[PDB]
Amino acid sequence: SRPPLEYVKGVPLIKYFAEALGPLQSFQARPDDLLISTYPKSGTTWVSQILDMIYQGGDLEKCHRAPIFMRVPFLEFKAPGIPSGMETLKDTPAPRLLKTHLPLALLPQTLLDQKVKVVYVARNAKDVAVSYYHFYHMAKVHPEPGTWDSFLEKFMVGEVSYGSWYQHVQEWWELSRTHPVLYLFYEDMKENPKREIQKILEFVGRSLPEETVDFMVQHTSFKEMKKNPMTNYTTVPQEFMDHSISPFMRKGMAGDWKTTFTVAQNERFDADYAEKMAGCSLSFRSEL
Numbered sequence: 318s319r320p321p322l323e324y325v326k327g328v329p330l331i332k333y334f335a336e337a338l339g340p341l342q343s344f345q346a347r348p349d350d351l352l353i354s355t356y357p358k359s360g361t362t363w364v365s366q367i368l369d370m371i372y373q374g375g376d377l378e379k380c381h382r383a384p385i386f387m388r389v390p391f392l393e394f395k396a397p398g399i400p401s402g403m404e405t406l407k408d409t410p411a412p413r414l415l416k417t418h419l420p421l422a423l424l425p426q427t428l429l430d431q432k433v434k435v436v437y438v439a440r441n442a443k444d445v446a447v448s449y450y451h452f453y454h455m456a457k458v459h460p461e462p463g464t465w466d467s468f469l470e471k472f473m474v475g476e477v478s479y480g481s482w483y484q485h486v487q488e489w490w491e492l493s494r495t496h497p498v499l500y501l502f503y504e505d506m507k508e509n510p511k512r513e514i515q516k517i518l519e520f521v522g523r524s525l526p527e528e529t530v531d532f533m534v535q536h537t538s539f540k541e542m543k544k545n546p547m548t549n550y551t552t553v554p555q556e557f558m559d560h561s562i563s564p565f566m567r568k569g570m571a572g573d574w575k576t577t578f579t580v581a582q583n584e585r586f587d588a589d590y591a592e593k594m595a596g597c598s599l600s601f602r603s604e605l
């Protein structure tokens with residue numbers, strides 16, 4: 318009941334996800350698999366619906382079969398009573414969509430050997446941090462988040478579930494130079510979802526009619542995804558995720574961080590950030 322984190326190979330993880338790593342050594346990847354990789358709260362559920370909808374040929378009826386966590390297995394998941402992501406995985410048919418937030422230090426090597434295709438979504442660190450703070454509150458398996466200010470301090474030293482945002486985004490960027498990785502930016506998806514859905518289609522080697530594409534742009538919108546109980550996580554026990562404290566689908570905005578970040582916090586973050594992202598051509602947008 319709100320246990321602390323357990324560290325493994327330098328990554329802080331939720332108690333259960335760490336345990337789940339045991340059985341996960343048994344996981345065998347297929348060359349037709351597709352891995353969805355992101356640092357938490359960077360748009361995983363967004364791109365999962367996009368991808369599942371593509372995989373279902375656009376049929377919103379086939380997408381309603383089960384919640385997105387039953388449809389896109391969560392590689393390292395485990396909970397009391399709720400079946401592990403590995404358990405779920407036994408029933409999931411090929412081509413499979415898989416989700417993870419594991420850094421490379423922990424990624425099943427099966428996945429890199431099998432040349433598995435990666436769709437990676439990155440989001441600006443300020444928005445991620447805010448999103449993560451609210452998530453910590455509602456997602457009961459997380460430690461106590463404490464105050465925004467303290468939580469932000471942790472976030473800068475990567476002392477939060479899954480560790481440092483900064484390393485996560487650079488390492489998977491680097492990986493994209495020697496591995497098939499489509500590296501997406503949440504803010505581009507905000508800017509122009511259609512442009513971004515087209516690039517995914519191209520990447521996944523599929524082709525769909527203009528009508529179907531536009532149909533997807535809408536059913537993958539924040540507002541549609543908020544109403545859809547197969548994607549908003551409301552079918553889970555309130556003891557596990559308490560939407561009354563904070564909804565999973567909270568705002569879905571680029572730039573909203575500015576209503577949480579104080580000026581002092583903003584100034585300290587920018588200074589810290591310039592150092593951490595020094596020798597990197599990664600370029601983020603904070604707004605619009």
Ligand SMILES: Nc1ncnc2c1ncn2[C@@H]1O[C@H](COP(=O)(O)O)[C@@H](OP(=O)(O)O)[C@H]1O
Pocket residue numbers: 355356357358359360361362363444447448449451537538539540542565566567568569570
């Ligand atoms: N279709 C969509 N369009 C835009 N944002 C979405 C979305 N579906 C979910 N989100 C937002 O993405 C974040 C969760 O990401 P993840 O899927 O990685 O956990 C939350 O951000 P906010 O808390 O900033 O609103 C959530 O509201």
